[PDB]
Amino acid sequence: MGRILFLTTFMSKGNKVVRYLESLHHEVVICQEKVHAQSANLQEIDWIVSYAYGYILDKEIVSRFRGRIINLHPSLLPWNKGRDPVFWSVWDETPKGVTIHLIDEHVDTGDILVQEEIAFADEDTLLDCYNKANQAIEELFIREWENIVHGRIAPYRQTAGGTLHFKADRDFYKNLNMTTVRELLALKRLCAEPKRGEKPIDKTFHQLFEQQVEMTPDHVAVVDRGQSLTYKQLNERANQLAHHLRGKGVKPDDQVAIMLDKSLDMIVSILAVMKAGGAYVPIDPDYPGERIAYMLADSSAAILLTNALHEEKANGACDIIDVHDPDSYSENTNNLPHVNRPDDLVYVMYTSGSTGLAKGVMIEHHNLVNFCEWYRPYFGVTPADKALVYSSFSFDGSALDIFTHLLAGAALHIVPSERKYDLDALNDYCNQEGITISYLPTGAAEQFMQMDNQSFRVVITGGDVLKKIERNGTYKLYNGYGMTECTIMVTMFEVDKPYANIPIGKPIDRTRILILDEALALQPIGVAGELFIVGEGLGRGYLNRPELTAEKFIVHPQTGERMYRTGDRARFLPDGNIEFLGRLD
């Protein structure tokens, strides 16, 4: 009949298409490589049929064979042009079908000959989809071939729009081939990029705090033993000190060290540093003098807010400002002119030097603002609540204590030394004062479940594996995961039942968790892998450690996004909650 060139790389040589064409007495030449005009495979060729051909025909060839190049593309063109059509058909959630079209001067854009719809079952695998489509289009070709040879089909131009994909676009999804349709789309919801319409955070913390002061100025803000400050009182005193600081040269991104024991002066100092424009570097005064001397040096802190008691532990490291000297406070009680942006430093905390020397973790305002903006509505915090300043102010767990509740109008209650380790005593305080919400490390939180409590409405815990769930009170328990580098915490779970492994929940606001293999490629739901963090949580990095910063804050090779690699193992559950599975090594 005629000699037909059959171009293809992925399909076999005994296709139902080739056999059918052969059955009509056509000599079918099978070529699976790029060719040129001189190729002996283009000799006496009546028709060219391409089917999953991974190369481009030269324009010289397309011109000579105009109207005689027929392509089998398993998609509903213009949807899913290019490579991996069936896969992106499912992922991008586009219309589905198979198209037999003419080949023109571009990628899968030529006019259509025949096209029909196709359906994939929710429980079909992507491989099943790939095969169901290849079989459908092969049958369509056999059915409509005669109509195409006699050129009685009027080719119609493709609808406007569609999508296009390239060979490498599927690299990130290389492990999803044996996944189910609905199992794949589930993974899409959990890990797909942010939706449209989002705007960057436009507020700093002290900006929002000054707002909260105007709303609840006379409400109690912080308590320590018998003494207390209201939102206005606290705000005015912090301004007085902030004015003095900014007058001593404090500028945005400057680090100011604070060295105090838990007290009202600590809260004033922290805010005062913020309002002045700097970022506070907390230094526990009980730390060994070695750590203190090193923290003060590695940090660029030119100023140190401290007592006269702990003044000598600096060994003259920097300019001292006595929080108890009236000369350290200005007359001006008014808020200062704003000079910060959400991407300015807000605080710098050092991780315990378990491995190697301690590193200074930088955190920006937008990092802290996002956490508090999520914390308030998630736990329904109102000015009626009262929370504990439990954790050492050198740990990011203290940021949860102080900063979240202050923006909700609640009241902070400083936890002194005598009721830090003695949790039974701390329990009585909570019932006395009516403490309603606080965060307790996994350890202390587990012991506190023994005590009888009627005050707490909610308690949050995290930092280690939360094995024990039984507790006497009536309050909700929450498990939270995260590290200092991504601001306090990134996921939250409400503990409703007991669990063998207790999940760490779903991501907070404007954060995304990805479970990746050793090649940084997505892992299907239920498969373990290194947990990666993306979004508003990621801080600036490690202070004066750019090489180490780049090691942990990566630019992904495929999606090009900035992610923090935790070094933790985890796996998604079918209901969206995350399961922690210990460290990597």
Residue ranges binding ligand APC (CB under 6 A): 351-352, 354, 462-466, 479, 481-484, 504, 566, 568, 580
The residue among 4 and 502 lying less far from ligand APC, judged by its C-beta, is 502
Residue 397 sits in the site that holds ligand KIV (CB under 6 A): yes
The three-class DSSP label of residue 228 is strand
State yes or no: cis peptide before 78, omega within 30 of 0: yes
Nearer to ligand APC, 137 or 488 (CB): 488
Distance CA 79, CA 56 (A): 20
Binding characters for ligand KIV, 404-443, by CB under 6 A (x = yes): ----------------------------------------
115 binds, among ligand KIV, ligand APC, none (CB under 5 to 8 A by kind): none
Given 53, 88, 395, 448, the residue binding ligand KIV (CB under 6 A): 395
23 touches, from ligand APC, ligand KIV, none (C-beta below 5 to 8 Å by class): none
**Residue 482 interacting with ligand KIV (CB under 6 A):** yes
Which alpha helices (H) appear in 452-502, and where do they start and end?
none
Among the residue ranges 36-44, 395-403, 513-521, 568-576, the one whose residues contact ligand KIV (CB under 6 A): 395-403
Residue pointed to by tokens 């506190």:
448
Residue indicated by tokens 């050793």: 518
The correct pick among 396, 485, 530, 568 for binding ligand KIV (CB under 6 A) is 396
Contact partner, 488, from ligand APC, ligand KIV, none, Cβ < 5-8 Å per class? ligand KIV
Contacts of 347 (CB under 8 A, 6+ apart): 279, 280, 281, 282, 363, 368, 399
Residue 485 binding ligand KIV, by CB under 6 A: no
The answer to whether residue 138 forms part of the interface with ligand KIV (CB under 6 A) is no
Please tell me whether residue 484 binds ligand KIV under the rule CB under 6 A.
Answer: yes
Q: Classify residue 501 as exposed, middle or buried by CB count within 10 Å of its CB (0-12, 13-18, 19+).
A: middle
- Measure the CA–CA gap between 513 and 15, rounded to whole angstroms: 43
Question: Could you give the CA distance from residue 282 to residue 295 in angstroms, rounded to a whole number?
Answer: 9
DSSP strands (E only) in 81-170: 81-82, 97-102, 112-117, 164-165
CA-to-CA dists, residue 407 to 206, 365, 371, 431, angstroms? 9, 14, 11, 24
Our CB check for ligand APC shows the closer of 354 and 432 to be: 354
Whole-angstrom distance between the N-terminal and C-terminal Cα of the chain?
66
342 binds, among ligand APC, ligand KIV, none (CB under 5 to 8 A by kind): none
Identify which of residues 480 and 505 has a Cβ nearer to ligand KIV in the complex: 480
Structure tokens at 393: 């102010």
Q: Does 385 bind ligand KIV (CB under 6 A)?
A: no
Inter-CA distances, 450 with 100, 254, 423, Å = 71, 44, 10
Which helix (H) or strand (E) segment holds residue 29: the answer is strand 27-31
How many residues sit close enough to ligand KIV to count as binding (CB under 6 A)?
12
Give which of ligand KIV, ligand APC, none residue 397 binds (C-beta under 5 to 8 Å, depending on kind). ligand KIV
* Residue 442 neighbours by CB distance under 10 Å: 16
Minimum CB distance to ligand KIV, residue 469 (Å) = 18
Residue 483 Cβ vs ligand APC, minimum distance, rounded to whole Å: 4
Residue 403 has what DSSP assignment? I
Residue with smaller CB distance to ligand APC, 519 or 584: 584
Q: Closest distance between ligand APC and the C-beta of residue 355, in Å?
A: 8
Residue 503 binds to ligand KIV (criterion: CB under 6 A): no
Q: Does residue 400 interact with ligand KIV by CB under 6 A? A: yes
Q: Using CA atoms, how far apart are residues 578 and 528, in angstroms rounded to an integer?
A: 10
Please give the Cα distance from 205 to 220 (Å, whole number).
19
- What are 511's strand-pairing partners? 535
Residue 465 binds which entry of ligand KIV, ligand APC, none, with Cβ cut-offs from 5 to 8 Å by kind?
A: ligand APC
Site of tokens 């000959």: 113
Which one of the spans 219-227, 238-246, 324-332, 390-398 is the region binding ligand KIV (CB under 6 A)?
Answer: 390-398
Which residues contact ligand KIV (rule: CB under 6 A)?
395-397, 400, 462-463, 480, 482-484, 488-489
